[PDB]
Amino acid sequence: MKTRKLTNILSKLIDKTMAGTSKITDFTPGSASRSLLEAVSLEIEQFYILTKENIDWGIQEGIIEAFDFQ
Amino acid sequence: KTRKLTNILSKLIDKTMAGTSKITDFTPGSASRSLLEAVSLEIEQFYILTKENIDWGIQEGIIEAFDFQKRQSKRAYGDVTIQFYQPLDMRMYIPAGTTFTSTRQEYPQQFETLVDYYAEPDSTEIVVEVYCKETGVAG
Amino acid sequence: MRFKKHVVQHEETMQAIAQRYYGDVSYWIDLVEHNNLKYPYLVETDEEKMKDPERLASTGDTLIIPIESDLTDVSAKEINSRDKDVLVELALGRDLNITADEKYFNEHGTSDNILAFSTNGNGDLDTVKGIDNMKQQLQARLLTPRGSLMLHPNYGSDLHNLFGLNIPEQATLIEMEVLRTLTSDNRVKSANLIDWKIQGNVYSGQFSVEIKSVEESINFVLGQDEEGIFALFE
Amino acid sequence: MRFKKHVVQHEETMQAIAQRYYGDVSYWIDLVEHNNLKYPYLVETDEEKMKDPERLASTGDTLIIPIESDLTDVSAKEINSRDKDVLVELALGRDLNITADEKYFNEHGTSDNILAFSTNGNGDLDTVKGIDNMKQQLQARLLTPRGSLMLHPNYGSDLHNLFGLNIPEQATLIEMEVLRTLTSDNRVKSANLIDWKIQGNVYSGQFSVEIKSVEESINFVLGQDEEGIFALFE
Amino acid sequence: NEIQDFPAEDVQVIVEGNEARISMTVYPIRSFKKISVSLVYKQQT
Amino acid sequence: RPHASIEVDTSGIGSEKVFCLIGQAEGGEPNTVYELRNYSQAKRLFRSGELLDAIELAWGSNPNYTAGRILAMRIEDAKPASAEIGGLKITSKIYGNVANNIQVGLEKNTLSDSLRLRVIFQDDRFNEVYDNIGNIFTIKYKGEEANATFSVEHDEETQKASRLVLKVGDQEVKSYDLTGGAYDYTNAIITDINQLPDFEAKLSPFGDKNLESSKLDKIENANIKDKAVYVKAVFGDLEKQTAYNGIVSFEQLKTIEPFELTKLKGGTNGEPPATWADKLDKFAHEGGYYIVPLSSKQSVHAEVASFVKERSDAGEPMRAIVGGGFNESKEQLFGRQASLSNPRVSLVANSGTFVMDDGRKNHVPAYMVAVALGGLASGLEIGESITFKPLRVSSLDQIYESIDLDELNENGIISIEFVRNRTNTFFRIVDDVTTFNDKSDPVKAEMAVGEANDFLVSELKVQLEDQFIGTRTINTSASIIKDFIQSYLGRKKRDNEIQDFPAEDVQVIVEGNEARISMTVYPIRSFKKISVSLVYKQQT
Amino acid sequence: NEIQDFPAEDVQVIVEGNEARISMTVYPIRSFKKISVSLVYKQQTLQA
Amino acid sequence: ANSGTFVMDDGRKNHVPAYMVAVALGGLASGLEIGESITFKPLRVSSLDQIYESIDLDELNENGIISIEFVRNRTNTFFRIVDDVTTFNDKSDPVKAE
Amino acid sequence: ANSGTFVMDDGRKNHVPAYMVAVALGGLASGLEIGESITFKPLRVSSLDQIYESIDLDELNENGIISIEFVRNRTNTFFRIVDDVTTFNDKSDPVKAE
Numbered sequence A: 001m002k003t004r005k006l007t008n009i010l011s012k013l014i015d016k017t018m019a020g021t022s023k024i025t026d027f028t029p030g031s032a033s034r035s036l037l038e039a040v041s042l043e044i045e046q047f048y049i050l051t052k053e054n055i056d057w058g059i060q061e062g063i064i065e066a067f068d069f070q
Numbered sequence B: 001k002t003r004k005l006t007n008i009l010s011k012l013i014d015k016t017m018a019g020t021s022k023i024t025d026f027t028p029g030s031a032s033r034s035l036l037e038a039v040s041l042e043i044e045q046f047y048i049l050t051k052e053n054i055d056w057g058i059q060e061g062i063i064e065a066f067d068f069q070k071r072q073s074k075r076a077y078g079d080v081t082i083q084f085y086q087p088l089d090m091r092m093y094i095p096a097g098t099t100f101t102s103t104r105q106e107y108p109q110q111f112e113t114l115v116d117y118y119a120e121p122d123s124t125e126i127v128v129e130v131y132c133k134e135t136g137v138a139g
Numbered sequence C, D: 001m002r003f004k005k006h007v008v009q010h011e012e013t014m015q016a017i018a019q020r021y022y023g024d025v026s027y028w029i030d031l032v033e034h035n036n037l038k039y040p041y042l043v044e045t046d047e048e049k050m051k052d053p054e055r056l057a058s059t060g061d062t063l064i065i066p067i068e069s070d071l072t073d074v075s076a077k078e079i080n081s082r083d084k085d086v087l088v089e090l091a092l093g094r095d096l097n098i099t100a101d102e103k104y105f106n107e108h109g110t111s112d113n114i115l116a117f118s119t120n121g122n123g124d125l126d127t128v129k130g131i132d133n134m135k136q137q138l139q140a141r142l143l144t145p146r147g148s149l150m151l152h153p154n155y156g157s158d159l160h161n162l163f164g165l166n167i168p169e170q171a172t173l174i175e176m177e178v179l180r181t182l183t184s185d186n187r188v189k190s191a192n193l194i195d196w197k198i199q200g201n202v203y204s205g206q207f208s209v210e211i212k213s214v215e216e217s218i219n220f221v222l223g224q225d226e227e228g229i230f231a232l233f234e
Numbered sequence E: 001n002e003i004q005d006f007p008a009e010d011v012q013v014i015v016e017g018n019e020a021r022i023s024m025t026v027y028p029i030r031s032f033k034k035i036s037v038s039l040v041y042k043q044q045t
Numbered sequence F: 001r002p003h004a005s006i007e008v009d010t011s012g013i014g015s016e017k018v019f020c021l022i023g024q025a026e027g028g029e030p031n032t033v034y035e036l037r038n039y040s041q042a043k044r045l046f047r048s049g050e051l052l053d054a055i056e057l058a059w060g061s062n063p064n065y066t067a068g069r070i071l072a073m074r075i076e077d078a079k080p081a082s083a084e085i086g087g088l089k090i091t092s093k094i095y096g097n098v099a100n101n102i103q104v105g106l107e108k109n110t111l112s113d114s115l116r117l118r119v120i121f122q123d124d125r126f127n128e129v130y131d132n133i134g135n136i137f138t139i140k141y142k143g144e145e146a147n148a149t150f151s152v153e154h155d156e157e158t159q160k161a162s163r164l165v166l167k168v169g170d171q172e173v174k175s176y177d178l179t180g181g182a183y184d185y186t187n188a189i190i191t192d193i194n195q196l197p198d199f200e201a202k203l204s205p206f207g208d209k210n211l212e213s214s215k216l217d218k219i220e221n222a223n224i225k226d227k228a229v230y231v232k233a234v235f236g237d238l239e240k241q242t243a244y245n246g247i248v249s250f251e252q253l254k255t256i257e258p259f260e261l262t263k264l265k266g267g268t269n270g271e272p273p274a275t276w277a278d279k280l281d282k283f284a285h286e287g288g289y290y291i292v293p294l295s296s297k298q299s300v301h302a303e304v305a306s307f308v309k310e311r312s313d314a315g316e317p318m319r320a321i322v323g324g325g326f327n328e329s330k331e332q333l334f335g336r337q338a339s340l341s342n343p344r345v346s347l348v349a350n351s352g353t354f355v356m357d358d359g360r361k362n363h364v365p366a367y368m369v370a371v372a373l374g375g376l377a378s379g380l381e382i383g384e385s386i387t388f389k390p391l392r393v394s395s396l397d398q399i400y401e402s403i404d405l406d407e408l409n410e411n412g413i414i415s416i417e418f419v420r421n422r423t424n425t426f427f428r429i430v431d432d433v434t435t436f437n438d439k440s441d442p443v444k445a446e447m448a449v450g451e452a453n454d455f456l457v458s459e460l461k462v463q464l465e466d467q468f469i470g471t472r473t474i475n476t477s478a479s480i481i482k483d484f485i486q487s488y489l490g491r492k493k494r495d496n497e498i499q500d501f502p503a504e505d506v507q508v509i510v511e512g513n514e515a516r517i518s519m520t521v522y523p524i525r526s527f528k529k530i531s532v533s534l535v536y537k538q539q540t
Numbered sequence G: 001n002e003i004q005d006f007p008a009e010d011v012q013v014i015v016e017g018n019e020a021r022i023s024m025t026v027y028p029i030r031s032f033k034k035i036s037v038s039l040v041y042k043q044q045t046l047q048a
Numbered sequence H, I: 001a002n003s004g005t006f007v008m009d010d011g012r013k014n015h016v017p018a019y020m021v022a023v024a025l026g027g028l029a030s031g032l033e034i035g036e037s038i039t040f041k042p043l044r045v046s047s048l049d050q051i052y053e054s055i056d057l058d059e060l061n062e063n064g065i066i067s068i069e070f071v072r073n074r075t076n077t078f079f080r081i082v083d084d085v086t087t088f089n090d091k092s093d094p095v096k097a098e
Helices: A006-020 A032-067 B005-019 B031-064 C014-022 C025-035 C046-051 C081-092 C102-107 C131-143 C168-184 C214-224 D014-022 D025-035 D046-051 D081-092 D102-107 D131-143 D168-184 D214-224 F039-045 F050-059 F097-101 F186-193 F234-241 F277-281 F298-313 F330-340 F366-379 F402-410 F447-468 F475-494 H018-031 H054-062 I018-031 I054-062
Strands: B075-083 B092-094 B117-119 B125-135 C003-007 C062-068 C094-096 C127-129 C188-199 C202-211 D003-007 D062-068 D094-096 D127-129 D188-199 D202-211 E012-016 E019-023 E034-042 F003-009 F018-022 F034-036 F070-072 F080-085 F088-095 F106-109 F114-121 F126-133 F137-141 F148-155 F160-168 F171-175 F219-223 F229-231 F248-252 F288-293 F319-322 F345-347 F352-355 F361-363 F416-418 F427-429 F507-511 F514-521 G003-005 G012-016 G019-023 G036-041 H004-007 H013-015 H068-070 H079-081 I004-007 I013-015 I068-071 I078-081
Touching: A006 A032, A032 B005, A032 B031, B005 B031, B031 C094, B117 B125, C003 C014, C014 C025, C014 C062, C025 C062, C081 C131, C081 C214, C094 C131, C102 F003, C127 C131, C131 C168, C131 E034, C131 F003, C168 C188, C168 C202, C168 E034, D003 D014, D014 D025, D014 D062, D025 D062, D081 D131, D081 D214, D094 D131, D127 D131, D131 D168, D168 D188, D168 D202, F018 F050, F018 F366, F034 F039, F039 F050, F050 F070, F050 F366, F080 F097, F088 F097, F106 F126, F114 F234, F126 F234, F219 F229, F277 F298, F288 F298, F288 F366, F298 F319, F298 F330, F298 F345, F319 F366, F319 F447, F330 F345, F330 F402, F352 F366, F447 F475, F447 G036, F475 F507, F475 F514, H004 H018, I004 I018
Parallel strands: C202 E034, E034 F003, F018 F070, F018 F288, F288 F319, F319 F345, F514 G036
Antiparallel strands: B075 B125, B092 B117, C003 C062, C094 C127, C188 C202, D003 D062, D094 D127, D188 D202, E012 E019, F034 F070, F080 F088, F088 F248, F106 F114, F114 F126, F137 F229, F148 F160, F148 F219, F160 F171, F352 F361, F416 F427, F507 F514, G012 G019, H004 H013, H068 H079, I004 I013, I068 I078
């Protein structure tokens, strides 16, 4: 986990979308494309955050398990 | 601890509605709902992948640093030699799954190849790798 | 919560407003108390209102009538035609246009990779609304094989297997499957056969679909005001 | 116990399999747990499976779906025509051919020492199956006098005593006795007269026998799977 | 279902010595290769 | 191949009687018709002015019969603001003096070694920065030779990048002639440069610009081994910077330079035209029926009257409603009615006040009321009358008496009478009379009656042209023509658009090309007197 | 609908030697390129 | 035209040429009733050496060539037979063509 | 008479002379049944170089020259053919004039 943030993910998605087609050029607030990509990137951000938290929890759990230090 | 498919889909739909009111159909068979469902399935699969990785790390991460290997169950595998009466008169093909066996009651274990093999015309004997169908020391 | 708001009309009185809304002139004192009005409640013009802008209201000023109003139980006859159009548009939902290029997926109905998204010409994703939306959804359901869509076993149709012999029996099977697929949509109040014929290879048929009426869609959308979702999870 | 076994199809997913069998994609994790699969569950080809043959499955590998399957309650429409032939053959039983040389015991129907075993031409005993078996058994019952067979008083027929006068009465007696003898067989769903005539000495008649249908025999044999006998003690 | 249909009256037979002259008409079997479906939308006010 | 097919029909779900407006506006292009459905669309298009207030009024004239698909136009011959700096040409989208306050200004960033643009327009709360102008890719070197340099130069005949060369010491590793080949874009160039054993042309971290290969700027003799040198192409990259977001367009006549945050100039609203004939022509074939000019000028009124007569002569019937002045005496109204004396023109006498949704108690002249009346008429069904309909006007500059109203109606002038304590509004429309004062003639005098006739004739003409013209002439054609006409006339009856029609009178005759038809109709009317007599009786 | 109409009676056939003579009449197909329609308004009175 | 792979009952993932597929198509045709078509019938082929596009299939059928098109998530198999065309390319003649 | 631009499905704007428009009329007429006419039929053209007026169309038609008009009165505009008149001049002969 590299701890990405929402703005970079959305910017990358919008940049690739523009690069694949010159027809789509309306990414203003309230647009359908921007909302969809925003939701996807938000979910990716939450996945990354929870993965970091779960890895921290896993490190504590493996320390407890390896030595049987209850 | 982790989100799930229904929760991810619901949050995606809520965020989409909040971003814009231009879309309001979220019924089954809708392109937009299908796309969000696919993204949700991928995220759930990544969540399961992270769960597997952390469950492995909990019981193997620390001890592995001290040069201690946990013995995994494996299928017995090895090389076998196949000899021909003469150099091959055409390209022979041995498909994956081709079974090898032994003519004894002591070893009823069955071995099979897991990959395709080709013997060139010029060859006269070719070696292939076979894998025991059963995990354990029986192979 | 919602309340009615009244614009002061020319030479109106509080008693008339009370009679008009509460059905009795006795509530005029309550109307004064709630709006915090001084004795000349409805002045002739804004010059008088300058004397006490806080406690007086002139013509064209908006009063508040604290009666619990609700958008349901409203006579559809009052609703404007544009308002009815917008209401049925909301009822039948807005979705991204995928059934563009009708000719292409009409030439290859049974195959996959047949339809795709499109742009509206203004650099935004294309969208189909109201009747266009219903057309898109009905076409997509009919075209989708049943059980192929993930997370939705029953969505689709069995027409891909009904490429049988040229007899009335297969015609009836096709008709029954089409009626099942159309009835599967909640918005389709009913569907029924119109006419069919067989020309050897080619089968031809036509159907009639009655979507929910304007009244029902209006009632549904105005009921949805209580929740504020204004969205479709059918 | 029996379970369904699924062959991995091209570019299949576990979610699709779960939807297909369990009717819901949620069981995919149970399917993984039961089959003991690592994260790339369905690899593209065997080169990836070489990396971890134990924990990965490629295309053409067989998965196990622990759903209690049962061969009864299966739609006969799926069953292949050869499978139906074999099932009715099992239902109607296999027996050693004794009614060979039809002419000889047709020339001496009432006497004993009329039929005998025969060889199949491959140095093994001859065998009659399905319809041939039913023919053999019905001929043998009709030809056997009632009460002559040991351990079976009621097996046989009374035709040896019905060599009476040339009137309709004896014709009716013969017909009734023949219908009784045919009804005595459990496999014969019904029998009925078609036509008869009298030519002085010689009587002639013909009957119609409806054996149990393919559906009933299929249901009987697939039910017998639960016991595993696959044999007939009627 | 091995044919579509046949008119029974068209079947003729003529017998003369050795020959037997026969004639008949049949509508032959086919399996569908295009299936078309049109829809009509209607509403009530 | 074999395949399934699917068709859908929608013709059964459903004239529209479109409404038009021409007037002054603070935004939008000149001499350009637009179709409007929402108020946010008109606010984006028309920034302000009377025209936007008229659109609002029209969509809020009546509670129950607001119009739709309003067609609007700007009469101001405005121009957009522009400016010049260095080799650049700056031009704004907005027409008028509003574009003058758009602020534009180029800067440089020392950390990125890249130009920067910042455009601010405080009226719309616009503030954006386009950092990293140019800086398309970085050239980097991983070898250990004496030196490593590159060079890109223009072709002066076309200002295109002639070559793109990588060198180790003095000789070349590989040169990409960008004027030829398939390396039209920078990404084709970088994808092959990165494959070299000891060279890299990494696209810049500041997004994937992906600019044309020929538009690269002129840079030669720069150390790759010491620096990650930037090839920039500032002008071609400004297309990527202003691809989608930006009020102001840019062009290059030369070299670009930074400059101060300077406001635009040259933005002009322009004087209004004296004659609207050239403006009016644009509505020749737009399909509109009711048009109202936003002007009190009698010359405009005569121009519109001529325009609607010409369009009615061309098979496109139109009608106009006019007004002007504040508190115009009855003499002026009679003079205006005598000057026009047109059936297809209606005069409005009263002027008053309207409560906008924004809260403005807008006191307006009489043509704004004529806009409102037009919007209400267009909202009504074909052949329904605007008689006694509510108007929702807040107040009026006069309250005419029962004699004054009778004089105005006898002179063919529309008027509004104060009325107390009615359920909807305190005002109603007395009559739908036209300027033509021949009350004996019901078609010319009454707006409703002639609108019914005109829509009936237009719809019959359009359907007969669409259906049968160009088709085949067979035996069933005549019967089919009669059945289609009968169905049409029964549809019209069902919609209450006519009173009744005798079916047997419909005749059809077909001979070669011609198709001679004849029919009878009882036309629609709306009541204008209602009488009720009572009789009293008793029992002893 | 390639032709409009034809009277079957006119189909007459003369056969003589190697020559066959046939007469017929056919009404050619035609396409509409003009429509003239007249409309007349009339009063009506309704009672009860 | 297409050649691919079949999962034998013995477990062999036999990659075979195209005439083995023609054997399979013949066995399926012979299995069908008299005058029933092999159009859109499932084949149960594991995989194929090519995945022809909607234009390539239209070219092959217009040239009187049988072809198999990949198809996703159908109840029986992931493949079906597009058409029962013969080498004789006179599509107007239904006896010779079909 | 008319020449205009045809927007190819490939995305090229084919601004073409009038004989390509004649090719389009011929391809339209070849699909139409015997006895029919291209009169009032759509042409599926994006734009035309000239928008002929009523006087111009009437003059072209009387001179026996085919022209196309742009219908803007409808809610959705399209181009339609006005007639299928031949270059032969005497209208008294309907067979040769059509």
